[PDB]
Amino acid sequence: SGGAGAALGRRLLGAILGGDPREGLALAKRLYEGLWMLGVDPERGEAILAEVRAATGLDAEIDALAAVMRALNATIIAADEELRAADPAAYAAVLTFADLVLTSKLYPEKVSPEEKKAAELFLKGEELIAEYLRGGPESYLTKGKEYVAEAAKILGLDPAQAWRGAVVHVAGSVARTPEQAAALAALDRTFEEALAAAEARL
């Protein structure tokens, strides 16, 4: 039991994947899309969740889960909001990377070989930034920058702007408490697994 987020996820997923497990699988994925976006891009996340709320009728639970997410990702939202306002070019690079990562994970067929490679490279760069911030050797930051710059080059983004955005965004994520990170990981596990079982029915 992962906390409020996972409890609300269990309820919502049971209703969506119950009955039609083909058009329910697509709705469940779209719900995950909205929740994942609340941190990095609140306007985009709320839009998708509004769509899903109109499709399912589970107003109380979707509205409540949005609130839990804003709480769990409060440090990421604040960091990314200041980043957007101070540095729209850097924030545009993180929005691009985030949308690429989410699509690589939910709808891999929508991703080309190069963009998929950029997604892998960026995620390795993000990991090294985060583990620098969590105590790793300074060479983690050097190598992290090499990954981000190469992913930026692939996508035609400017590496200096991509890097600013990546470091600020990761810093906002690393600043979550371990309780918040555990809650988010529990919600994440809830989705990945219910979507596994619904990948056996289809």
Residue numbers in the entry: -1 to 200
From the paper:
Here we present rotamer inverted fragment finder–diffusion (Riff-Diff), a hybrid machine learning and atomistic modelling strategy for scaffolding catalytic arrays in de novo proteins. High-resolution structures of six of the designs revealed near-atomic active site design precision.
The second active site was taken from BH1.8, the MBHase with the highest activity to date. We determined Michaelis–Menten parameters for MBH18 and MBH48, the designs that showed the highest conversion after 8 h for their respective catalytic array. With a kcat of 0.025 min−1, MBH48 activity is 1.5 times higher than in BH32.8 (kcat of 0.0168 min−1), a variant that emerged after screening 13,590 clones in 8 rounds of directed evolution. However, it remains 45-fold less active than BH1.8 23H (kcat of 1.13 min–1), a BH1.8 variant with a regular histidine residue instead of Nδ-methylhistidine. Additionally, by-product formation in MBH48 is minimal. CD experiments confirmed the expected helical fold of MBH48, the most active MBHase design, with an unfolding onset at around 85 °C. The crystal structure of MBH48 agrees with its design model (Cα RMSD 0.78 Å), and the desired catalytic geometry was reproduced with a sidechain RMSD of 1.07 Å. Such precision might explain the high catalytic activity, however, our results show that high activity cannot be inferred from precise reproduction of the apo-state alone.
